[PDB]
Amino acid sequence: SPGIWQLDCTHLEGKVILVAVHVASGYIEAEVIPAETGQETAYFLLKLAGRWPVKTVHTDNGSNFTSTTVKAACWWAGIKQEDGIPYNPQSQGVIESMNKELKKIIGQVRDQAEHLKTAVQMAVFIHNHKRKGYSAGERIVDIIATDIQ
Amino acid sequence: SPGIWQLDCTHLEGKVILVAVHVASGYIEAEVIPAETGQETAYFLLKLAGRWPVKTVHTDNGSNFTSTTVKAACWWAGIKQEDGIPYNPQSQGVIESMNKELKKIIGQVRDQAEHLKTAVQMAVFIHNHKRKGYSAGERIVDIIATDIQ
């Protein structure tokens, strides 16, 4: 559970926003890409696993689940690739809610930058730092530090 | 000191590798960019601070120290920008050694990908996961969790 992440893809300004959510904490990393391809998703997971102890990724769709490039990156990085089927139905809504909150934040910062990617990183910052009294950034560090010891 | 990071720029294949080192743990994030500009450096720090509690950044040179874009990103992200002057004479050496180690890893994985950026991220992965017996990834999480509590 300290190592379980969910991939999420959303669309804005004709571009794709790829998100990895740390399930237990609600912490996120995100990138803007022109279109979701296996190569991009693979590259994004490699980056993520080099930064956090990623044991399991719940993939966002069947194209990424099938992708030979995505499977190669997961093998390289020691990641168990899983489907993202919400056997828990309170997961579909939780992601939808996160895309909504994310997009709200991006709207709140959008004028602060020309490039969508800049506004997306600002939104990642504001999301991870928001106290709800611990923030996502706090929760992920505590969850994982507890696991290490 | 849980929040202190050092910027480092190194060169390979006619490109720039931008590195942020978490001073206490030796954990790193890195990116490939065409050339170090204030805008790229600013963007890299924004990404970094949204992912980890960055209190202080020791900038890698006087151009980034002066950069009005870099100062604007630091202000936005709550980052104290400082010089990277190695008042401890053993800071020049640690960085030199890290660039050497990094470039060595990149050499050990280089054939595993066409794009330098892919090899750099593999190298980041291998660096952060190496047991030294705790890894850099383990140390940074330990250091910061101890601070949160």
Ligand SMILES: COc1ccc(CNC(=O)c2ccccc2C[N@@H+](C)Cc2ccc3c(c2C(=O)O)OCO3)cc1
């Ligand atoms: C990240 O540091 C920041 C430092 C300062 C600001 C303040 N806002 C403005 O000055 C501004 C506002 C609106 C439109 C254009 C601009 C001018 N640009 C240069 C901002 C910028 C810088 C670095 C980047 C960017 C962009 C971008 O516009 O997307 O894209 C990737 O690296 C934002 C971000």
Ligand SMILES: COc1ccc(CNC(=O)c2ccccc2C[N@@H+](C)Cc2ccc3c(c2C(=O)O)OCO3)cc1
């Ligand atoms: C991260 O997932 C990986 C999955 C598999 C491999 C195995 N190695 C090869 O198949 C290979 C080896 C040498 C040359 C070209 C290739 C073919 N490409 C498509 C690998 C690749 C994929 C995604 C990317 C890349 C690149 C790249 O070549 O740099 O750049 C940004 O996103 C590496 C990385």
